């Protein structure tokens, strides 16, 4: 079961109906939920209470909270993942906002950030996907982590810095 | 991937999961990767 | 899309540089515009061009009105083209450009009633080791008490030819405006004197 709810300043919830509408310094974010899913703010902090309790319920429960709490650090602090390009001649440049891979493929890989995401590069050997929506970011750093998975013999291609990739080790 | 009728753990990892009407087996190691389907 | 009507005329030899190329001389006379169909009148966009001319003494009364409805001059042939336009009358000048690949579409020369060896290739049989089913005649139409019939489409003799056809991607070699003549590489369908339609690649490489 989940209940705590840190709703720091910047926020602005609006449980108006099922579109549990939100607005913060990072940009108004909206996350829908279950109506019979009871929730609003009490006193200062917040909480999503529930009707029945066992499964069909306690699940959406433990869902919504975790979800809203997100939009919080959401419009509050914004999210950003840091990827690592690794291997001989692996490197990303850029084009406007376009992430530009260069990872062994006979021709270069261009990646374009969607409606509310942004690419950044420190050294053409490390990456970053910041943004508002925790999902998308993950839901995209993926698409970048996918342009090339790490190998079981040298763990190349994109990865998660503190990524644990042991090597099979061959000949 | 291992499609076996009888799907069970094979070490203190094997994490029997249930994705779309299927019985799965995700272990930290792969050769334990199972799946009735 | 684009396109114009024409008449086949014949093939002949022509060298583009040092490589001789056979070519089908087509004549895509200037084409009139006799009715602009629009997805607001006929529920769809398209055009109606005309071709060979016609003496008015042959021209039905109703047909006159239709042509007169644009003051064109009775053609004798009308054909539609989807998503086209221009203003005035359609010729090949500017339309097709030397180098374009096209889809010529005439009417196959009609081969009358043809066997299977000829209409579907088949193989007939023997010619010497026993027979009565020398060469042509199909082998067997089916199986037995199962599918106690024959399938819908089994290939058998029939009228072959006289069908619409389309030979895609042809290289408009030369183009003699001032003569609505055009020259295409390869062979176009149907015989000389036949109506062929030339369009832009239906979908080319």
């Amino acid at each position: 079961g989940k209940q705590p709810i840190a709703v720091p300043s910047g926020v602005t919830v609006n449980a108006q109906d099922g579109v549990f509408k939100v607005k913060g310094p990072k940009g108004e974010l909206t996350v829908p939920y279950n109506t019979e899913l009871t929730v609003r703010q009490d006193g200062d902090q917040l909480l999503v209470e529930r009707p029945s309790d066992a499964q069909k319920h306690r699940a959406l429960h433990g869902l919504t909270r975790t979800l809203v709490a997100n939009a919080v650090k959401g419009v509050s602090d914004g999210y950003t993942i840091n990827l690592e390009l690794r291997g001989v001649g692996f490197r990303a440049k850029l084009t406007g906002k376009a992430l530009e891979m260069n990872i062994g493929y006979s021709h270069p890989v261009i990646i374009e950030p969607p409606a509310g995401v942004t690419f950044a590069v420190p050294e053409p050997t490390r990456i970053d996907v910041s943004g508002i929506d925790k999902q998308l970011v993950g839901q995209v750093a993926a698409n970048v982590r996918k342009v090339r998975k790490p190998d079981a013999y040298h763990g190349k291609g994109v990865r998660f810095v503190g990524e644990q990739i042991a090597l099979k080790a061959g000949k | 991937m291992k499609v076996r009728s009888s799907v069970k753990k094979m070490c203190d990892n094997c994490k029997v999961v249930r994705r779309h009407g299927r019985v799965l087996v995700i272990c930290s190691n792969v050769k334990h990767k199972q799946r009735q389907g | 899309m684009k396109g114009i009507l024409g008449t086949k005329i014949g093939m002949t030899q022509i060298w583009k540089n040092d490589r001789a190329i056979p070519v089908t001389v087509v004549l895509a006379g200037p084409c009139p515009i006799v009715q602009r169909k629009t997805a607001q009148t006929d529920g769809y966009e398209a055009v109606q061009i005309g071709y060979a001319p016609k003496a008015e003494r042959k021209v039905n009364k109703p047909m006159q009105g239709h042509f007169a409805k644009a003051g064109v001059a009775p053609t004798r042939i009308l054909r539609e083209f989807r998503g086209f336009a221009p203003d005035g009358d359609s010729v090949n000048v500017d339309i097709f450009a030397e180098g374009e690949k096209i889809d010529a579409t005439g009417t196959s020369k009609g081969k009358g009633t043809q066997g299977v060896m000829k209409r579907w290739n088949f193989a007939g049989g023997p010619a010497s080791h026993g027979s009565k089913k020398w060469h042509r005649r199909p082998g067997s139409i089916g199986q037995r008490k199962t599918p106690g019939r024959v399938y819908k489409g089994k290939r058998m003799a029939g009228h072959m030819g006289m069908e619409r056809v389309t030979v895609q991607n042809l290289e408009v070699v030369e183009i003699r405006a001032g003569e609505n003549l055009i020259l295409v590489k390869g062979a176009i369908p149907g015989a000389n004197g036949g109506l062929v339609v030339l369009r832009s690649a239906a979908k080319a490489s």
Partner: protein, 142 residues
């Protein structure tokens, strides 16, 4: 001795298909069509009012509108003429999803067929009301 026939009647009803469970609705349509509270209430010929359905496109199903509901359709000599589509796949022609689930809950004989004729669906709403100039007693489902 039992009662005879009439005719000079052709009740022109307009059921709504919105959100309602296709089937249920169907049964209803299939009801009136064939013979509701029926006039002379008779077999021989039909007196079952004319039905107009709007929307349709927004009919309703349940677990399967992707799974299970597969409207099959086997063409010419079945030389692999096995053509089927998911019901959701009937987003090209919701119109038929209904229309073709009712001609089922209707006699299949000579008359029976002449009875789909009176059923008349429209994937829309108000615009549909155009193909509607007679009566229009809106007798929604339940």
């Amino acid at each position: 001795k039992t009662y005879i026939p009439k005719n000079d009647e052709q009740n022109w009803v307009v059921v709504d298909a919105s959100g309602v469970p296709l089937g249920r609705l169907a049964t209803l349509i299939a009801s009136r069509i064939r013979g509701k509270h029926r006039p002379d209430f008779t077999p021989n010929m039909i007196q079952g009012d004319f039905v107009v359905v709007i929307n349709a496109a927004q009919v309703a199903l349940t677990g399967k509108k992707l799974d299970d509901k597969v409207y099959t359709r086997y063409t010419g000599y079945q030389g692999g003429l096995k053509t089927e589509t998911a019901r959701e796949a009937l987003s090209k022609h919701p119109e038929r999803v209904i229309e073709h689930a009712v001609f089922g809950m209707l006699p299949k004989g000579r008359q029976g067929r002449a009875m789909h004729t009176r059923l008349k669906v429209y994937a829309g709403e108000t615009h549909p009301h155009s193909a509607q100039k007679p009566q229009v007693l809106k007798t929604q489902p339940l």
